[PDB]
Design a protein around this ligand. Sequence first.
Ligand SMILES: *P(=O)(O)OC[C@@H]1CC[C@H](n2cnc3c(N)ncnc32)O1
Ligand SMILES: *P(=O)(O)OC[C@@H]1CC[C@H](n2cnc3c(N)ncnc32)O1
Lengths: 139, 144, 141, 137
Amino acid sequence: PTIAELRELSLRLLTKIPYLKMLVLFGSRATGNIDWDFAVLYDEEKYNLYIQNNPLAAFVIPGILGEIFKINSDKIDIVELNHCSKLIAHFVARDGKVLYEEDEFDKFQQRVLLSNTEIKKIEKTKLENIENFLQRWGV
Amino acid sequence: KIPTIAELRELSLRLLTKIPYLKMLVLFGSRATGNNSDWDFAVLYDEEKYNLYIQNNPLAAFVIPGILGEIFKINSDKIDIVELNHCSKLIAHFVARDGKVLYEEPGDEFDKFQQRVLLSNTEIKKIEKTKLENIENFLQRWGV
Amino acid sequence: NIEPVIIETRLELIGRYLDHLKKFENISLDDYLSSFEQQLITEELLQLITQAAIDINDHILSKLKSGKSYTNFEAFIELGKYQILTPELAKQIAPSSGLREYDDIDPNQVFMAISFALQQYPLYVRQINSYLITLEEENDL
Amino acid sequence: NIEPVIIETRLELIGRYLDHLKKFENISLDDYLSSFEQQLITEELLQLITQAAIDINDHILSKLKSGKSYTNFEAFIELGKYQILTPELAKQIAPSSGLREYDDIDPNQVFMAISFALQQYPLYVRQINSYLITLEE
Ligand SMILES: *P(=O)(O)OC[C@@H]1CC[C@H](n2cnc3c(N)ncnc32)O1
Ligand SMILES: *P(=O)(O)OC[C@@H]1CC[C@H](n2cnc3c(N)ncnc32)O1
């Protein structure tokens, strides 16, 4: 399905996912070089009421998208933007394409994007953990 | 593309190059019965050849599904492998009863396999009783 | 027809996995979060349990509605329509099918799934066991 | 056009998984067969490690040979053709890609894979780490 096609079917997602505030397609399918990566942002208030008559509603999310988008539910990855790492949020904002919102994606972009100075600071931190591993293991 | 059993039988001849120690390959499960799921394959290895091969390649069992997926042109992620050399009597029973043979060397290896692992209904019902006794014991212990 | 030995093997495994899973029944969220190995064990058990139940559902539906394709979720619901499971249990347990590239597995959500499974899957064993006993009587008359 | 932070995150996870997996370095085969939980931990760690490596390989080959389709096995081999991995290590470790309705898992073969991973994947960490340092220049 095309990005435009995915957006048209997404209007019907409010019925099956009522607490949904925004859905973003990121990853390889968004980057222009064709699994499917999907990021969701929830209404924290509405989600807590629903999580009471359905304790595992997060585990049903991939099936709901697969049935509507007609994509293999086994190859669908879901990132919950309400509680994910800054690094994952950054890449969702930078390359992702918005599929449903209720000026909400731009607010999300401005709130989680990272500068190159912040990214190079993170990547330097990770290289330190990798080098300590290599040192501790004598390889 | 879903290949026919005849097509699988032609493609299986190419397994000797990638799996030299392969003695028998059996398609069992739903794909043998007739009923969009996974593919079940049972393999019989030459234990002598397998030990020589496992020396130079310690994880050769883990490449088998990838080898079949490339040759049968089926999704490697939906390929299940049962190693008949270390499987339960019950699984061996169902491989023999409904399975369809795809490769054997020699040609009387599946029939000899059937006679050696098939179970009578009296043996099968004895297993069903032991499992039902464990299931009812579980239910009693959990108070449901 | 339906082959009881296939279902009874998965039911026996579900009970075995559940007996293992109960060893964490009284573990605190703090103790659960501080042990990655325990998180690996519990996440692994819930996967084995759900897979066994999925296999049971698919075998049963292979004979009642032969040829029809069901997703893991609707398979549970369809067992409630055939009264093999109570519709309450089918609706309460069908999201469990979601338990089977990105490390999106939240330990806080899995910790909830432990108590979920310890409450719903024993009932799944009971109701499926009764369906088998139902099968033994119809096979006689 | 290659993202070091993406590779470094997966590499850092591999190191964490391996530090956990090292707790099984001196375990006996008999003790391993008598513990279902240790088999679950071990089976889960090996899956997490290889999956990260496959993700790293997929990201790297995404930039060099963009558009070409590679299986998980051939990806390891292709990293040897570009000298990112030593051809020796690429050949020795590519069968790891196989670690990623019937419960036909043999504990004896997984037990062998513990020692395999503890010897080959640090080399993978070292070799990929050197590729990253090359990218800085
Ligand atoms: P994606 O397009 O492949 O990029 C991944 C992005 C950069 C690193 C970060 N990331 C990946 N995997 C992570 C885990 N397991 N934890 C935190 N951050 C992660 O997202
Ligand atoms: P298949 O037709 O779905 O299974 C064949 C037969 C039914 C029970 C038995 N079986 C399946 N899976 C088993 C495990 N994990 N252990 C013992 N027996 C098993 O095979």
